[PDB]
Amino acid sequence: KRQVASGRAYIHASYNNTIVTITDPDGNPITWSSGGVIGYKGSRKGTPYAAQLAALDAAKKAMAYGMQSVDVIVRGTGAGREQAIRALQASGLQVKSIVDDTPVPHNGCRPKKKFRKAS
Amino acid sequence: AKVKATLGEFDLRDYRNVEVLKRFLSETGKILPRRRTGLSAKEQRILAKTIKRARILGLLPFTEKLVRK
Amino acid sequence: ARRRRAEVRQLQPDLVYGDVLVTAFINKIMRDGKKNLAARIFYDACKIIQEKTGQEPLKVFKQAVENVKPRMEVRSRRVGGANYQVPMEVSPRRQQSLALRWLVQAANQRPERRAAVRIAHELMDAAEGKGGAVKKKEDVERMAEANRAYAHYRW
Amino acid sequence: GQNFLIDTNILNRIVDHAEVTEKTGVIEIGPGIGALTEQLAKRAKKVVAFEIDQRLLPILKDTLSPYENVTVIHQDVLKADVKSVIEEQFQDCDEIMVVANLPYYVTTPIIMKLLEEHLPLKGIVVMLQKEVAERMAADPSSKEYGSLSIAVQFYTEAKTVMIVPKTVFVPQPNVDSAVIRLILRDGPAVDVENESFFFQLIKASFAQRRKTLLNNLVNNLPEGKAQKSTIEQVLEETNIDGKRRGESLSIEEFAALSNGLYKA
RNA sequence: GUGGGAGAGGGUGGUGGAAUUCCCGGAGUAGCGGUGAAAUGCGCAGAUACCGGGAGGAACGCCGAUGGCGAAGGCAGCCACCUGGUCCACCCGUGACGCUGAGGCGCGAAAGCGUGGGGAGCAAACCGGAUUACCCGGGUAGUCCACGCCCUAAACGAUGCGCGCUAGGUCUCUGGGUCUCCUGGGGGCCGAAGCUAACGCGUUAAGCGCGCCGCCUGGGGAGUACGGCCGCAAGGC
């Protein structure tokens, strides 16, 4: 549809779920994939295998738009970051760089009950 | 190898000596601890003050992104 | 066992063919310590194999055995009070054990009246690539990596 | 299974407190194991048991051979109407009692809703915690006072019949159990314009207890949210109520306040 | 007094970025979120991922320390102003001007409260869901500011203050000198003599002495009753 020929793949690796979004350099999201769209529900949504499947699915459905090379930045500290990145790079798109951009507060808002008691 | 080792002669209160200041920041725009810098606390404290001041001036990054998986 | 690693018994190879796997199959057929009956029934089945199928029955046996040798199995796991059929690799020893057991179990299920007929038919069918033993192997294999999500539990 | 009382002594004493006689009738809520039911049925003209537990009912049902007054009705007391029960099962004995030794997280809403159900019965005796027992049977200007005391003031005058040790209960609760009595009044304790409006008022007053009556009524009341600008006349309508709280005031004070509220 | 030093000590203005939540757009397809597993819940009025612009409140990531400051309670972005305490050096001035302290006066975490503001996030009470027959989804006061109350704690080093004497070893913070080292002050860990019922303390004494103050006289009843004083109240002595 667009055929930018060079975009970027965002990997939102939360604890409960992993989300993969591929987009142009302009930030316009062409498409996305998740553990949920594969069909996995509940606990197994954030499993490394689900991350692998989500990465492959996103890559496959992105190949239709003619994407060949991406520059990935990973977000979140979920269990399946490494699995997702390896699957994505071993899907058929030549990744230039692999980067993390996990958002960390500068001691801002007061977190949830469970996430408190910071050292 | 401590960051101090791979350096010569400089001033710490000089909040404009930007080129040496990039040295004391990590792969991410974080101030390296005393284990990495290789300074005494007084030096570490004054350097941290200077680093924050330069950050306010916009000469230095508050944070960056790291090229790794 | 807690202490040792329970060294494997080295079966004496059969005298007819000089093969240990033949001895394993003989022992697997055996019940109530009737060695002679198991040997005779196996040799009968070999006669059927020879009569109906050209090549030596040992080749058919080996072909079927390597046809049934699985590669993936599930082991019930206890994590957070839930049962997980965690896929795991099977060792060659366990491979052959399961293959022999499955072949013998499947051979008995056949409606044919005589034992030798059942053994020969099941074994030759497994050599072909189908039957009961092959079906069970495929079922086991597909049951594994159907939930390869849980495979992160290395055991 | 919750903490179950095992003492025949205190059970006898409590069933005495229930005044279960020939004339007296019994409603059983959550028959459970069937010790209370044992001590009640033998002296009751007709026992109607309500429970929704799957298997806690039919097992007990086996033991109910010697008893002829055990009309066990398998349903939830909250969900199911009880009005019909008065006509159908109290033909033997018009007198009504409700006795319970259940866990309190189920017991207290059951009692509240039963009183809301508007069924005219003589009284109720239930088993509850010490703190909640103090909360119900409370006097003005108390820490144990609140809206619950006000609610129960319309229906009954209460007093803990017999304080219960923790030992008698199998697992031991940390806090002492105290059985209270609730014997329904002839009618409403003090008259009011609207019952629902009264309840809204009492909720508003005791929402943020520590604050002044004025600060409570300014922010708590929904119609107060409407007439925030108008609260001036609300202050005007107050009679002999100065800088005050909720706990300070009594049943008649709140009743007069509600009657004044309708006139605003 | 003079010449220097370190420091989240306090008060007043100013403003730096990263989050979080909303608003305004562009693209985006079926889920998002949540758990031990789930449900409630949000999403076809196009959610969640993601790009840009804007608003608002709160708190300061690495440095960071087993660190520092203060009489305690406490004090972390940065800049500037007004101030409190303290250490070393020169031995320069005074001549005992000192110690403690019943009442008094003042300060006093957090939670409450009155009168006005503010409200991003979290969250008493509360509305929901569910299972192990606590936990997740929402949400009020409150947490934020100005003025005025409240005066309570495991307010702890469970150790009142000041001064003098009694082996050392080791790690730190901060000064001075003639700089492998000497000499001060602060914070930890072992341990002489000694002390203690014991645990343990030990030049930062719980050692050896002196001065002053505050408390104790078996456990409950009971920090209760009465009386008094202080508060709007809860409550405090």
UniProtKB/Swiss-Prot annotation, chain A:
PROSITE patterns: RIBOSOMAL_S11 (PS00054)
InterPro entries: Ribosomal_uS11, Ribosomal_uS11_bac-type, Ribosomal_uS11_CS, Ribosomal_uS11_sf
Keywords: Ribonucleoprotein, Ribosomal protein, RNA-binding, rRNA-binding
Transmembrane intervals: none
One GO cellular component, as annotated: ribosome
Superkingdom of origin: Bacteria
Location of the region described as Disordered in the Swiss-Prot/TrEMBL record: 99-119
Gene Ontology biological process terms, A to Z: translation
Residue ranges, compositional bias (Basic residues): 109-119
Entry's Gene Ontology molecular function annotations: rRNA binding; structural constituent of ribosome
Entry keyword Oxidoreductase: no
PANTHER family: 40S RIBOSOMAL PROTEIN S14/30S RIBOSOMAL PROTEIN S11 (PTHR11759)
Function of the molecule: Located on the upper part of the platform of the 30S subunit, where it bridges several disparate RNA helices of the 16S rRNA. Forms part of the Shine-Dalgarno cleft in the 70S ribosome, where it interacts both with the Shine-Dalgarno helix and mRNA.
Record family assignment: Belongs to the universal ribosomal protein uS11 family.
Protein name listed in UniProt: Small ribosomal subunit protein uS11
Gene: rpsK
Swiss-Prot record, chain B:
Keywords on record: Ribonucleoprotein, Ribosomal protein, RNA-binding, rRNA-binding
GO molecular function, one term: structural constituent of ribosome
Any GO BP annotation: translation
Gene Ontology CC annotation, any one: ribosome
Endoplasmic reticulum among keywords: no
Cysteines engaged in disulfide bonds, as pairs: none
Assembly, per entry: Part of the 30S ribosomal subunit. Forms a tight heterodimer with protein bS6, also interacts with protein uS11. Binds to the C-terminus of IF3 and to the central section of Era.
Family to which this protein belongs: Belongs to the bacterial ribosomal protein bS18 family.
Role of this protein: Located on the back of the platform of the 30S subunit where it stabilizes the close packing of several RNA helices of the 16S rRNA. Forms part of the Shine-Dalgarno cleft in the 70S ribosome, where it probably interacts with the Shine-Dalgarno helix.
Protein name per Swiss-Prot or TrEMBL: Small ribosomal subunit protein bS18
Organism: Thermus thermophilus (strain ATCC 27634 / DSM 579 / HB8)
Residue numbers of the full-length protein present here: 20 to 88 of 88
From Swiss-Prot, chain C:
Keywords of the record: Ribonucleoprotein, Ribosomal protein, RNA-binding, rRNA-binding, tRNA-binding
Gene3D superfamilies attached to this UniProt entry: Ribosomal protein S7 domain
CDD domains: uS7_Bacteria
Presence of keyword rRNA-binding: yes
Family matches, as SUPFAM superfamilies: Ribosomal protein S7 (SSF47973)
Annotated signal sequence range: none
Gene Ontology biological process: translation
A cellular-component GO term for this protein: small ribosomal subunit
PROSITE patterns named among the record's database cross-references: RIBOSOMAL_S7 (PS00052)
Listed InterPro entries: Ribosomal_uS7, Ribosomal_uS7_bac/org-type, Ribosomal_uS7_CS, Ribosomal_uS7_dom, Ribosomal_uS7_dom_sf
Coiled coil ranges: none
Any one Gene Ontology molecular-function term assigned to this protein's record: structural constituent of ribosome
Pfam family, one: Ribosomal_S7
Function: One of the primary rRNA binding proteins, it binds directly to 3'-end of the 16S rRNA where it nucleates assembly of the head domain of the 30S subunit. Is located at the subunit interface close to the decoding center. Binds mRNA and the E site tRNA blocking its exit path in the ribosome. This blockage implies that this section of the ribosome must be able to move to release the deacetylated tRNA.
Family: Belongs to the universal ribosomal protein uS7 family.
HAMAP family, per database record: Ribosomal_uS7_B
Summary of subunit composition and partner proteins: Part of the 30S ribosomal subunit. Contacts proteins S9 and S11. Binds to the C-terminus of IF3 and to the C-terminus of Era.
Listed name of the protein: Small ribosomal subunit protein uS7
From Swiss-Prot, chain D:
EC category name: transferase
Binding site for S-adenosyl-L-methionine: N3, L5, G30, E51, D76, N101
Keyword Chloroplast found: no
Any one GO molecular-function label of the UniProt entry: rRNA (adenine-N6,N6-)-dimethyltransferase activity
Family membership: Belongs to the class I-like SAM-binding methyltransferase superfamily. rRNA adenine N(6)-methyltransferase family. RsmA subfamily.
SMART domains: rADc (SM00650)
HAMAP family membership: 16SrRNA_methyltr_A
Record's keyword terms, sorted: Cytoplasm, Methyltransferase, RNA-binding, rRNA processing, S-adenosyl-L-methionine, Transferase
Protein name: Ribosomal RNA small subunit methyltransferase A
Origin species: Bacillus subtilis (strain 168)
Gene: rsmA
The UniProt record lists the keyword Cytoplasm: yes
Organism domain of life: Bacteria
GO biological process: rRNA methylation
